[PDB]
Design a protein around this ligand. Sequence first.
Ligand code: VC1
Length: 217
Amino acid sequence: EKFAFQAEVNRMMKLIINSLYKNKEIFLRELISNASDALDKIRLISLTDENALAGNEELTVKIKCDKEKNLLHVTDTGVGMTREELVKNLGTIAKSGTSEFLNKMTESTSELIGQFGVGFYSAFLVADKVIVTSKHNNDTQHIWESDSNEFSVIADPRGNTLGRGTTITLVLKEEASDYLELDTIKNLVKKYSQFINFPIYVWSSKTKTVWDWELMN
Ligand SMILES: COC(=O)c1c(O)cc(O)c(Cl)c1CCc1ccccc1Cc1ccc(F)cc1
């Protein structure tokens, strides 16, 4: 139920960290493209699958902050992940390179983390804990949880609430407090959604103050 990160993931996690202490806001870029990739993969799958979109009809990205409890959620209706994918895809880096890329890191690292798809780990730049809730079309909903010193994957007590897709939940660090106010999340979401192909919304105030989803691109 508990697991240890692979050694290179630790080396990578530190390399991502002490190289982008200055460009902290790139985590939201990497979470938004990581959602698009996931949303693509299910649109591809839906070409050859009469029922790939059973678990959820829509293909969106929904971002919700939560200043009262210090949380940022980024939820896509993409392909989702299984228990085993959670453990392997997020507990290992072995897809290609995986040691090749840690030379050139230490050898303006903002571009290169995106190139290699390891952008997920920039989340630890602003989070004390990172929580991945995900639902694949061939598995039950699971939760992945880590503070970088280990992680655990558990079945979700709540059943299937996602339909299909993934939530990234960040328990934000204290310094990162400004990513909890509307206007500055919307700000960064616009800057990084310009070329994403799916609609991206932000639970927002259009004041009698009322909250609906607000589209950003
Ligand atoms: C499909 O995934 C999502 O649902 C999703 C999603 O829907 C939104 C997201 O923000 C993320 Cl991160 C995912 C998971 C992305 C993913 C998915 C599969 C493999 C790897 C990766 C990232 C990764 C992790 C560790 C590495 F070493 C390299 C890359």
